[PDB]
Design a protein around this ligand. Structure first.
Ligand SMILES: [K+]
Ligand SMILES: [K+]
Ligand SMILES: [K+]
Ligand SMILES: [K+]
Ligand SMILES: [K+]
Ligand SMILES: [Mg+2]
Ligand SMILES: [Mg+2]
Ligand SMILES: [Mg+2]
Ligand SMILES: [Mg+2]
Ligand SMILES: [Mg+2]
Ligand SMILES: [Mg+2]
Ligand SMILES: [Mg+2]
Ligand SMILES: [Mg+2]
Ligand SMILES: [Mg+2]
Ligand SMILES: [Mg+2]
Ligand SMILES: [Mg+2]
Ligand SMILES: [Mg+2]
Lengths: 51, 119, 67, 82
RNA sequence: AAGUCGGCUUCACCCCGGGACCCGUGAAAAGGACAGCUAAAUGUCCGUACCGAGAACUGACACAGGUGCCCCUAGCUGAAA
RNA sequence: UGUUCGGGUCGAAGCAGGGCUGUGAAGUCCUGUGGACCGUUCACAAACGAAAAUCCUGGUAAUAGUAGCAGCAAAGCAGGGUGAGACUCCCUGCCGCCGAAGGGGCCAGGUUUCCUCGGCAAUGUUCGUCAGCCGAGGGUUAGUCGGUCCUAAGACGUACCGUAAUUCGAGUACGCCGAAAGGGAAACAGGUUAAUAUUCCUGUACCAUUUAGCGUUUAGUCUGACGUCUCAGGGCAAGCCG
RNA sequence: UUAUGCUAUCAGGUGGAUGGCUCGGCUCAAGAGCUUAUGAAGGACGUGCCAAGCUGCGAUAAGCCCGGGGUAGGUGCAUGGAGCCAAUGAACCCGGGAUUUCCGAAUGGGACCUCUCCGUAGUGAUCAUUCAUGAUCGGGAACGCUCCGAAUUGAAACAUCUCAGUAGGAGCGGGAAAAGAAAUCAAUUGAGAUGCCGUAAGUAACGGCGAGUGAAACCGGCACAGUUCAAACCGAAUCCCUUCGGGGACAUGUGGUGUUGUAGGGCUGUUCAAACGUCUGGCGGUAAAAUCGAACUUGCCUGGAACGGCAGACCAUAGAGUGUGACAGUCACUUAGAUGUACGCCAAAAGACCGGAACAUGUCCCUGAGUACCGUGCGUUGGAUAUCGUGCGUGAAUCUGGGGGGCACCAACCUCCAAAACUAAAUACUCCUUGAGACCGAUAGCGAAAUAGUAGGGUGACCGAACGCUGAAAAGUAC
């Protein structure tokens, strides 16, 4: 239970909501040309450089 | 519009590819019929949704129909009767290039159309 | 057409503009609350057009020195 | 500048209506005083207290207890939740 | 469901007091007390989930290391954890 | 590239194989494949020719269905479920492991891993219907818990002065920061959720400031505020006995 | 049916070479060139109906308002669903506005806290002014100026030297900067501000006289431009702010005059009359999006599709090119050639204004000091006893004067007038705009054909990828 300030937790929240798959409708719209993005990660890996 | 400033294929295609929407309007030009060219003083006009055109190139040469829809980004028009039947069997429009058709009757429900065509 | 045009906003009075701004804020609150449950909006473009109408009203107010 | 974005309508947030509390998503820049004044001006009901939390979506949630009984139901009916 | 009683011991915790040692002397400041009682109002901001490790940390790993044995721990045997 | 003369959707380049010519570098043709470009005369250029550099980049073998999936904690079995599929997921029983740590609490750190549902291509050293994995949704509520306040070692800022000069430099003066294990105003028990709970709810409290009334200094002291070792007395959580 | 194998070909798998294509790259040329306290660049976070990245935007958040151009569609990279907007003229482009969170020069205080504390609501620091107000700060691809300043390396070792005033550092600073109107260069008698280019010339000069380093003038060009103070004489005759009342500066001198070498100016007298320049003025040019722009979409053949072949018809101040289902002057955008354009910029006629130029006379007055010079030390230089700088020391003269003429001094001759100030153009550069190319063509060309300084790596300073392509049309395979 490390203790974050408001901004550190906001940056963690942004990192968390960035770690989502591309929407299926985006894949349909681009005709399978956009299927991923570079901000995918896993929590148990090389950590965030955010906080 | 692409002047003789650049005769290079790369610059021509870059200008067309990144054309603004008001420039892509002019890409919808089509040849006017002999009567229309005589009674407008210009050789060509932009194909609009609604006017009647005759397809003069492709698999549908000779067909006359009304323009159902226009896409400025694709630079294509959709004509009544120019369709592609799909594996379902349902009929889907086949998009056409406006330079492959000829306007035979203009839609003039817009009072601004006459000056749009010329001047 | 749209909810209300620039001519409509400039034609109203100060109190009328404030009342319409409050009503648009209420409609935006209701629509955003509906989407809070995850469910799709009944009118997907309505939210964006409400927001842009609110912006237009605020701009007319700022021009007229009300805010 | 209104601090109140919209009522939070989830299962847990809807369980507040049976205790006369109502949960809102609010501007994260605002505080409890601003939230109370904004809600009291927005619906005209006296607010007994404000509970606020920040989430991992970057949002700020405010739970408002009201003084007058049924005020949460009246606001939830005015908004369109109920 | 009972829910009533007694006794023993008591660390590794609390209170209190003594002694010894130092060519070693073992922080500061905010705050508090010494004159306050009654009533009403106010108490904003940030954190708060969960892991805290032989799988949630770190060592490229669901790593026999390290961070942390950091702080705690029942009965018998036994001086004893 | 300049220039001359051409070929191509009646099928260019490229590719696989073959025929012929040439000492040869190579050229040409044929068949297939391929679907839009390609040559040629005379000249001119160059980022112009690879088998080698423990060459570089990519791809891919043998090794090999091999090593490993044992050594420091040798752990599973029966019956019943679920499921397309069960050593491996769930229940009951039996048999076991840790039991001053492998349990409990929490710092730093992590950052959603938490909870529910739905999945099983990859991850998991096997499998998998399981999962810290994948997808979707949900979850963190404070006057009293911390931070916040104070100052410590010690930083930083401004000024002064130095320096060719500075974002550089010691000191001084004034400030300001520096402890989630030092100091410190105050809250407890119970309940509630799937996931929060001294935070929400019930009950019963407490502290601080401002205001209003009722009264006022004793003022400068004490407290905060302290090392190591050793010991007595009293109490008590835990423990034990009738 | 000889297994395990071996050699060749074929079919398929894997793989991603080759070819073809390319909205990218690179290089060169021509333009254009500052911005920020009216809060920039940059960053953080947020912002979309379904939205994770990038891009845009800022709680009015892929956007709001006005004018012009454009006109029928639009809703970014990125044609998915559902809606919304748009003839009340949207989208789009040009111009002008509004909104514009937090950090950041960051500037009320504090930041291992992009937030937090006081809230007396914030002119942080250093400065100018009368104390109304104002200036400075950060950023900018390179270029510019000032100052500080290595080593590898070469000398086939190495020390002076070289590398090299390079690399790197600090400060300043603009569209350019610096320089700039001779105390000059010459040589027997001349030229006439500065910069940049060519040449002188690898010459003179320096140098273990080794290796090496290395000018300038003359001359030919580009472009041309000259002036302002200090003082003499006069003595408040001036300048600034202003609420128009007045206030501030100023006799330690505001202003006038004056500005220089075969001396000039002042003071006294005479003559000629006034050139340059500043302001107004906007004939007219330059000038936004943009507008118009000839002539085939004719027959047959091939084909999925003609821009092809074979007949036929035309334009050309347009046969540059690109797109379009295969090769297009005549299908589309264009092109050649004409038009138009808000704000701006230059700008001629014509007016208003301070005023300019010669001579005579001379026990007359003025003409820049720790300066010029010199001694000594060091750096630097080709600068050699003869470069420039600057540390210490020393230190003048006043037109009957002073400096220079490559060691010092004497003489002659020639030449200039420092120690105060400004000054366009010719020049440099490439973030940016346009154009071009015997350039590269996806392991190339920028690292990046950009969800690329990204993924990823490093505590950090920093290092740093890979990945292009269905088809004419999704007709993206019904049952
Ligand atoms: K907890
Ligand atoms: K050598
Ligand atoms: K050596
Ligand atoms: K066409
Ligand atoms: K073509
Ligand atoms: Mg090879
Ligand atoms: Mg045991
Ligand atoms: Mg497996
Ligand atoms: Mg809280
Ligand atoms: Mg502190
Ligand atoms: Mg600057
Ligand atoms: Mg050497
Ligand atoms: Mg000068
Ligand atoms: Mg040199
Ligand atoms: Mg042409
Ligand atoms: Mg590359
Ligand atoms: Mg490259």
């Amino acid at each position: 239970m490390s203790h974050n300030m408001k901004g550190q937790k906001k940056r963690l929240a942004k990192a968390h909501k960035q770690n989502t798959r591309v929407p299926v409708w985006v894949i349909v719209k681009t005709n399978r040309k956009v299927v991923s993005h570079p901000r995918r990660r896993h929590w148990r890996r090389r950590s965030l450089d955010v906080k | 519009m692409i002047a003789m400033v650049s005769k290079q294929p790369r610059k021509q295609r870059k200008a067309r590819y990144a054309a603004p929407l008001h420039i892509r309007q002019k890409f919808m030009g089509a040849r006017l019929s002999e009567a229309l060219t005589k009674e407008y003083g210009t050789r060509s006009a932009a194909v609009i949704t609604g006017d009647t055109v005759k397809v003069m190139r492709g698999d549908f040469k000779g067909t006359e129909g009304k323009v159902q829809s226009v896409s400025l980004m694709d630079g294509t028009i959709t004509v009544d009767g120019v369709i592609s039947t799909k594996v379902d069997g349902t009929e889907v429009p086949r998009p056409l290039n406006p330079s492959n058709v000829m306007i035979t009757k203009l839609e003039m429900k817009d009072g601004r159309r006459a000056s749009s065509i010329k001047k | 057409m749209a909810i209300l045009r620039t001519s409509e906003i400039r034609t109203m009075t100060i109190e009328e503009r404030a009342d319409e701004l409050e009503n648009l804020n209420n409609e935006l609150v209701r629509e955003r609350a509906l989407t809070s449950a995850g469910g799709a909006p009944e009118n997907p473009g309505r939210i964006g057009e409400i927001r842009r109408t609110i912006a237009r009203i605020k701009t007319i107010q700022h021009e007229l020195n009300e805010i | 500048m209104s601090s109140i974005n919209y009522p939070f309508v989830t299962e847990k947030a809807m369980m507040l209506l049976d205790e006369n509390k109502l949960q809102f998503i609010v501007d994260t820049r605002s505080n409890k005083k601003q939230i109370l004044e904004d809600v009291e001006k927005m619906y005209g009901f006296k607010v007994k207290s404000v509970r606020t939390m920040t989430t991992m979506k970057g949002m700020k949630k405010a739970v408002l207890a009201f003084e007058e009984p049924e005020a949460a139901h009246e606001i939830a009916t005015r908004i369109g939740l109920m």
